[PDB]
Design an enzyme around this catalytic site. Structure first.
Site, PDB file in Angstrom:
ATOM      1  N   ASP B  34       0.841  -1.188   0.000  1.00 33.42           N
ATOM      2  CA  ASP B  34       0.000   0.000   0.000  1.00 33.42           C
ATOM      3  C   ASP B  34       0.882   1.247   0.000  1.00 33.42           C
ATOM      4  OD1 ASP B  34       0.956   0.227   2.607  1.00 33.42           O
ATOM      5  OD2 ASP B  34      -1.022   0.220   3.551  1.00 33.42           O
TER       6      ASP B  34
HETATM    7  P1  8Q1 Z   1      -2.145   4.579   0.366  1.00 34.50           P
HETATM    8  O1  8Q1 Z   1      -2.432   2.962   0.556  1.00 34.50           O
HETATM    9  O2  8Q1 Z   1      -2.522   5.043  -1.174  1.00 34.50           O
HETATM   10  O3  8Q1 Z   1      -3.087   5.429   1.424  1.00 34.50           O
HETATM   11  C1  8Q1 Z   1      -2.662   5.601   2.758  1.00 34.50           C
HETATM   12  C2  8Q1 Z   1      -3.761   6.487   3.414  1.00 34.50           C
HETATM   13  C3  8Q1 Z   1      -3.627   6.412   4.959  1.00 34.50           C
HETATM   14  C4  8Q1 Z   1      -3.574   7.948   2.924  1.00 34.50           C
HETATM   15  C5  8Q1 Z   1      -5.135   5.936   2.975  1.00 34.50           C
HETATM   16  O4  8Q1 Z   1      -5.289   4.646   3.481  1.00 34.50           O
HETATM   17  C6  8Q1 Z   1      -6.281   6.814   3.492  1.00 34.50           C
HETATM   18  O5  8Q1 Z   1      -6.631   7.777   2.889  1.00 34.50           O
HETATM   19  N1  8Q1 Z   1      -6.960   6.448   4.742  1.00 34.50           N
HETATM   20  C7  8Q1 Z   1      -8.058   7.283   5.251  1.00 34.50           C
HETATM   21  C8  8Q1 Z   1      -7.916   7.378   6.788  1.00 34.50           C
HETATM   22  C9  8Q1 Z   1      -6.611   8.109   7.160  1.00 34.50           C
HETATM   23  O6  8Q1 Z   1      -6.271   9.069   6.542  1.00 34.50           O
HETATM   24  N2  8Q1 Z   1      -5.792   7.603   8.271  1.00 34.50           N
HETATM   25  C10 8Q1 Z   1      -4.546   8.286   8.636  1.00 34.50           C
HETATM   26  C11 8Q1 Z   1      -4.856   9.581   9.414  1.00 34.50           C
HETATM   27  S1  8Q1 Z   1      -3.293  10.310  10.011  1.00 34.50           S
HETATM   28  C12 8Q1 Z   1      -2.837   9.458  11.566  1.00 34.50           C
HETATM   29  O7  8Q1 Z   1      -3.286   8.381  11.793  1.00 34.50           O
HETATM   30  C13 8Q1 Z   1      -1.898  10.157  12.575  1.00 34.50           C
HETATM   31  C14 8Q1 Z   1      -1.127   9.224  13.541  1.00 34.50           C
HETATM   32  C15 8Q1 Z   1      -0.102  10.038  14.388  1.00 34.50           C
HETATM   33  C16 8Q1 Z   1       0.946   9.165  15.142  1.00 34.50           C
HETATM   34  C17 8Q1 Z   1       2.010  10.028  15.880  1.00 34.50           C
HETATM   35  C18 8Q1 Z   1       2.900   9.231  16.874  1.00 34.50           C
HETATM   36  C19 8Q1 Z   1       3.982  10.174  17.462  1.00 34.50           C
HETATM   37  C20 8Q1 Z   1       4.522   9.936  18.663  1.00 34.50           C
HETATM   38  C21 8Q1 Z   1       5.601  10.877  19.255  1.00 34.50           C
HETATM   39  C22 8Q1 Z   1       6.560  10.377  20.034  1.00 34.50           C
HETATM   40  C23 8Q1 Z   1       7.652  11.277  20.642  1.00 34.50           C
END
Ligand code: 8Q1
Ligand code: 8Q1
Ligand code: EDT
Ligand code: EDT
Ligand code: PLP
Ligand code: PLP
Lengths: 84, 75, 124, 395, 395, 124, 84, 75
Positions: B34
């Site tokens: 993906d």
């Molecule tokens: P690709 O297979 O073409 O697509 C991937 C994505 C995720 C873009 C696709 O699957 C999609 O559009 N999904 C829709 C849902 C979505 O966008 N999920 C992701 C949202 S962003 C997120 O999850 C943020 C997580 C943050 C983690 C931070 C951890 C940090 C820790 C700090 C420590 C010091």
């Protein structure tokens, strides 16, 4: 309107790249692993307002990572025994 | 040993046996990757070969041969 | 709060009226020891309507704002209407915390003091 | 929006950058428990602990074995006053302090009064200084402890600590001083001053909040009943995990203060004289609370007659100050200030980082707004008309 | 030289980088005293204080008015145990706790025993868990308080908190739990668990050292006698200056833990199973102290027969661990461990930042050096020769 | 300290001798409950000189190092000279803290135990 | 052997230049003023070992200034009223 | 107003009246400046004219005219 997919993938790369710059082994390994696990866990979210909430939370944590990487470089120390 | 270390990297990253990692194979359509795997794949190649792959180049690295070609053309 | 500070940064009706006037009622309430002294003066026309008012207050910003707002509010009301001004109205308009509600009470006390000093002169 | 000038150092101080720099390694990589005896995270944490202990001890002329780390001067005051009174309760039941002490010293004493102890709250003179001869007369055969702060947090007056030590030493009474507002600002020597116990606060000396120390004399041994039970850390006198980053900051602040105290005193004195003189030469009816002959220059408490203090603080919307503050005013009442004038008092604080530009700004704005508030004041209007205020039937 | 792996999180934790990031603005620019009511340095400091209070309250399901900031779980334990016993002393004089509590809970109780209180130190079973029915039988008409920790700092066993709450609630006895080793690691809800008081430590949950909290229930109102006298900060229950940077870190740590607890538990459990299984499958005579059916996986306490623990810790020169530690072993004695086996116990700690590589390294080195120490051990040599050790006349 | 840890990282004379020998003296001191058990064996030639020695210790590093050092020190001394080995000498060489001086005491107890087990066999 | 005069003047410039980069007004004005006052106060020291002690102390404080300037930039805030 | 603002800067820095700040005057030998004043003088000119004066150039700025010349030749 901003693209959520373009944002998420660009945030994914920038967050991983920045976390890899952590000097401390325990912060570096945790951040890289946590980002990889969190983005994967939230992959199938559909609610556009839930995604924007996650995106904003990621942008905030990218600022945390950037700042904490730098202060970890200003106040660094030796590596652990297992990095040899 | 040779620059075909690219194949080994694609294998470990996508969890695919080295026999299935063919030159004409694409990560998404042939190896079940993906958009999250491919981000990690590009970075993995970046760390393996001590190179910097910018966004406009990483978007073109979608097949195994494309990855071998970019690395061979960047020392 | 911005509503309370406004009455100092943008003062209004600060001053004095003629205590010797039969149409001026002066109310002086509080004590310097209690940190809050309020002087409120009103001017009434010959029809019973307060046409002007002045104040001077020694006290915190909430007390300054309470008596400043009361001096605004009495203007344009009659002597009978001004009696109905309640401390709860002053506190609501200024969003006063419970530790400053005594300021509204003294501001109400100032209105009724000046109103009584006026009505005392109107006896003959 | 632009931020106000900080002129409130008696309430708390900013971190000295040297102190923050010293703490940060213990907030990032050296996070070990100083009581972990079996590994290097503990060893290096303990070494930083003991290094800080020596830094605190050097500033006040103590032995590091006499320095106990606490969470602040509040807890130290409790350990000294309650710990001494409870240890000797079987033979001594009388304690002595002053009417102008910090509220933590006073409430600890009121707490002991309800436990069956007799407490003498000594008065001060109009200067704010105790009468040494009244202290001697107050000492009873069962007097356990005398506690007098070194510098007052509200008016900055300096009590005669060394002379109090001679009185207490020569009568075998323990002497505790709350030095929170004095450590690193004026010279302190436990031996020369004959101090038995001393309270220290980190955030009054440009170190971090949440840390302090108590000096407890070991020769002759001063005994204290511990109040915080636990694993026996800090020689059984203050149990709990010693917070290495915080105590490292306290030690660093004490070492910086030991190096900077002379320079700071010269600069702050000159700035303090400038603030007092330029206000008083431009405003009538301004009185300073506390004798300037026995005064720390960085704490200036002035009264502005016919103006209420909180309104003045509000009028000075771009300067951070306080009025009647505990770091009405029982301190001002104790030095015999009129009740009306006690409502008219403002505390200016000048510190290591204050600039001449900030003093001049504060002085100008203070002059400007005392005049404005006086023009709004009915008491000023009455006085302008030759009315004696002490002849009006108020309330 | 290269630094050892940190496997000692029950003693203290590193700062989570998110926590340090949240604190640093209050260590640089927002240094105001949260009790300074007259200026913006105070207003912004107070707002960060109250924001942190809500973060702590959300994690445990409390109302922010029920959260009091302290200097650590040691002080909270003192406030709960001594404050409750002293408030009701005119009607209630009996307290109940366990034999495996943290030393601060035990010494606070021994302190109260000398003040005239009756304390029942409940035993635990071999599992380390109390018997609920023995607790019910122990409750007397004058029982004032029951105090049982949520997770044990030495062996990680989980006491039945919710079931203890039902016993205490239905008898109108106050229930306090020392949750220092549990907050942010296992679910906590004061209402569901019927908790009246709870102790919280910041540095056990990746927040800064020198800060903690005590939950005190307000409905029905739980009354506590304050121990630290002062200006009346924290609703008169804990006087002293609230250290804004430290409480901001505690709140941030509580919010991170609320978000990460599920993910951490899955990862730590898997790592804990791997450490226990790979050691025991490669070493004979290894026993885990505490019932795995009621156990927090991040605290693993194992005994290695015929090897003394301190020598094993020395042999593991590149792993930071502990043995018989208070965050001989009274905890191990209390679960009926043999005295010789109590000298053979090691505590492994696995946390938010531990990696599989660290566990595997620790496991390999532990296997290696238990074999070496057994080859140096005379007790192992005697057993290898078919000698029963319980038949030798020692001493 | 490096001096104490050296006796584990670089072990020496770890092992056992023949308890059935008339020239081998075995000393077993301590208790498993006390966390410190010391087995020290010496081998004496027919001239009275200890020519070899072995040890095994269950205990902390200071105890391991104390009995390891004692096993080194008895080698090359006679039975009479080995009696003069004092716990204070072991502690000084290892720079032992006061909380570990009991290890030196037990190490001295181990030497004298093995020496007594040897002298008991030499009676006929 | 290193030149003490060349070292001191180069340290003087670097220390002042770095202190001027402090975002916070109270740290910036203090550091610039303190460095100027300290170098002037120690101008007439003659003991070569006393100078080396001061030089080393200055080099250590230059590291403090460099690190604290950077973290003050990562966690900056608005200027004070008097900087307008 | 003109680029002779250099003169005003030298005056405030060394505490010398503008009448004594002549073009041929040297900071050390004519205006009582030491090596600490000159470091501050160079920095003062640096802040006034938004320029960067490196060490090899600052060593040549020892007179008033030299300071006017360097600033005039650097925008
Ligand atoms: P690709 O297979 O073409 O697509 C991937 C994505 C995720 C873009 C696709 O699957 C999609 O559009 N999904 C829709 C849902 C979505 O966008 N999920 C992701 C949202 S962003 C997120 O999850 C943020 C997580 C943050 C983690 C931070 C951890 C940090 C820790 C700090 C420590 C010091
Ligand atoms: P110039 O007139 O040709 O010569 C100037 C010098 C000083 C080089 C000349 O006078 C000389 O050689 N003097 C000999 C004595 C000497 O060298 N004194 C200076 C020693 S260096 C010094 O004093 C260090 C002071 C450090 C202050 C740091 C303050 C930082 C605070 C941090 C805040 C966050
Ligand atoms: O897991 C990661 O990506 C972070 N580290 C893991 C640690 N490294 C050692 C090191 O980076 O020094 C691997 C290891 O532990 O050997 C590698 C990196 O990206 O730099
Ligand atoms: O005193 C100094 O050199 C530091 N500051 C003093 C503060 N400035 C304002 C500002 O720099 O924003 C002067 C002032 O207070 O107006 C000036 C600088 O070098 O940047
Ligand atoms: C600040 C203050 C205290 C309290 O110290 P903390 O560190 O805040 O607990 C005690 N005495 C005086 C004089 C103080 O100014
Ligand atoms: C850490 C610990 C304490 C003490 O907490 P501090 O914050 O160090 O004062 C109390 N109880 C338990 C179970 C602990 O692990």
């Amino acid at each position: 309107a901003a693209s959520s997919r373009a944002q998420v993938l660009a945030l994914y790369r920038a967050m991983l790249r920045e976390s890899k710059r952590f000097s401390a082994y325990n912060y570096r390994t945790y951040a890289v692993r946590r980002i990889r696990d969190a983005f994967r866990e939230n992959k199938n979210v559909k609610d556009p307002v839930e995604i924007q909430t996650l995106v904003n939370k990621a942008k905030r944590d990218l600022g945390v990572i950037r700042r904490q990487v730098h202060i970890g470089q200003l106040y660094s120390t030796d590596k652990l025994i297992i990095e040899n | 040993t040779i620059e075909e270390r690219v194949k080994k990297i694609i294998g470990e990253q996508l969890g695919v046996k080295q026999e299935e990692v063919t030159n004409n194979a694409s990560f998404v359509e042939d190896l079940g990757a993906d958009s999250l795997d491919t981000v990690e794949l590009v970075m993995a190649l970046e760390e393996e070969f001590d190179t910097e792959i910018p966004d406009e180049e990483a978007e073109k690295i979608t097949t195994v041969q494309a990855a071998i070609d970019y690395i061979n053309g960047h020392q | 709060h911005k509503k309370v500070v406004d009455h100092y940064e943008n003062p209004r009706n600060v001053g004095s009226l003629d205590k010797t006037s039969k149409n001026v009622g002066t109310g002086l309430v509080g004590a310097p020891a209690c940190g809050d002294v309020m002087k409120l003066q009103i001017q009434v026309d010959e029809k019973g309507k307060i046409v002007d008012a002045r104040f001077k207050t020694f006290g915190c910003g909430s007390a300054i704002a309470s008596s400043s707002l009361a001096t605004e509010w009495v203007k344009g009301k009659t002597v009978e209407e001004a009696l109905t001004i309640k401390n709860t109205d002053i506190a609501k308009e200024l969003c006063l915390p419970p530790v400053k509600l005594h300021c509204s009470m003294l501001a109400e006390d100032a209105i009724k003091a000046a109103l009584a000093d006026y009505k005392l002169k109107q006896e003959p | 929006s632009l931020r106000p000038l900080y002129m409130d150092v008696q309430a708390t101080t900013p971190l000295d950058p040297r102190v923050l720099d010293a703490m940060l390694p213990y907030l990032i990589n050296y996070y070990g428990n100083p009581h972990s005896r079996t590994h290097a995270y503990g060893w290096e944490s303990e070494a930083a602990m003991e290094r800080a202990r020596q830094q605190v001890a050097s500033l006040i002329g103590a032995d590091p074995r006499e320095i106990i780390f606490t969470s602040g001067a509040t807890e130290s005051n409790n350990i000294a006053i309650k710990g001494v009174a409870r240890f000797y309760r079987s033979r001594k039941k009388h304690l002595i302090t002053t009417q102008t002490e910090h509220k933590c010293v006073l409430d600890s004493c009121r707490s002991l009064e309800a436990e069956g102890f007799q407490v003498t709250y000594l008065p001060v003179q109009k200067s704010g200084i105790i009468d040494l001869k009244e202290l001697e007369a107050a000492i009873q055969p069962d007097t356990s402890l005398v506690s007098v702060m070194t510098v007052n947090n509200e008016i900055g007056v300096k009590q005669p600590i060394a002379e109090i030590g001679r009185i207490c030493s020569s009568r075998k009474v323990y002497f505790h001083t709350d030095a929170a507002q004095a450590v690193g600002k004026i010279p302190l020597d436990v031996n020369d001053m004959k101090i038995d116990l001393m309270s220290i606060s980190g955030h009054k000396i440009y170190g971090p909040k949440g840390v302090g120390a108590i000096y407890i004399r070991r020769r002759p041994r001063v005994r204290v009943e511990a109040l915080q039970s636990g694993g026996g850390q800090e020689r059984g006198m203050r149990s709990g995990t010693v917070p290495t980053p915080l105590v490292v900051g306290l030690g660093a602040a004490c070492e910086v203060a030991q190096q900077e105290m002379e320079y700071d005193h010269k600069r702050i004195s000159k700035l303090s004289e400038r603030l007092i003189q330029n206000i008083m030469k431009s405003l009538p009816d301004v009185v300073m609370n506390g004798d300037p002959k026995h005064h720390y220059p960085g704490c200036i408490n002035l009264s502005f007659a016919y103006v209420e203090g909180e309104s003045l603080l509000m009028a000075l919307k771009d300067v951070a100050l306080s009025s009647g503050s505990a770091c009405p005013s029982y301190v001002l009442r104790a030095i015999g200030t009129d009740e009306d004038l006690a409502h008219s008092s403002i505390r200016f604080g000048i510190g290591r980082f204050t600039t001449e530009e900030e003093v001049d700004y504060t002085v100008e704005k203070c002059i400007q707004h005392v005049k404005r508030l006086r023009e709004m004041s009915p008491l000023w209007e009455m006085v302008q008309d030759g009315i004696d205020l002490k002849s009006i039937k108020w309330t």
